[PDB]
Design a protein around this ligand. Structure first.
Ligand code: CA
Lengths: 53, 49, 41
């Protein structure tokens, strides 16, 4: 079921954390790139952010 | 040696024990923002490959 | 044959976990999981 993968994700929320270089001057943004992982074999990467998709 | 081959040695694939030296060092956060910046030598397994 | 209690067999001795059924993904080779009967869509 699609709902089985979201049972513990309904209890979570987005957050605002700082990240450098939104525009020019290191904002506080709803999108905040944390822990980019790039150890695959065809240039496919996984990006963890603060927003909820 | 923190950068050569054995900077992360675990006795089996799911061991709770884990030996790891990586020359981790914490730095001061700057100019009034909340983050934890650190500094460590890169991976010795990646350098071995 | 049949698979275990934590696996749902699609067809031709290839089984997937129980949460992997009707989850918008045709994981099985015969795509039996999302069929209108098991999924109803
Ligand atoms: Ca599926």
């Amino acid at each position: 079921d699609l709902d089985t993968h979201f049972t513990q994700y309904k209890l979570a929320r987005p957050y605002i954390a700082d990240c450098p270089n939104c525009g020019h001057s290191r904002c506080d943004s709803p999108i905040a790139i944390e822990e980019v992982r790039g150890d695959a074999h065809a240039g496919v990467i996984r990006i963890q952010t603060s927003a909820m998709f | 040696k923190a950068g050569s081959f054995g900077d992360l040695q675990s006795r089996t694939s799911t061991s709770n024990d884990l030996y790891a030296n990586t020359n981790l060092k914490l730095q001061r956060p700057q100019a009034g923002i909340v983050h934890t910046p650190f500094t460590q030598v890169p991976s010795g397994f990646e350098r071995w490959k | 044959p049949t698979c275990g209690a934590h696996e749902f067999q699609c067809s031709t001795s290839s089984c997937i976990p129980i949460s992997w059924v009707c989850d918008d993904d045709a994981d099985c080779s015969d795509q039996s999981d999302e069929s209108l009967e098991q999924c109803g869509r």
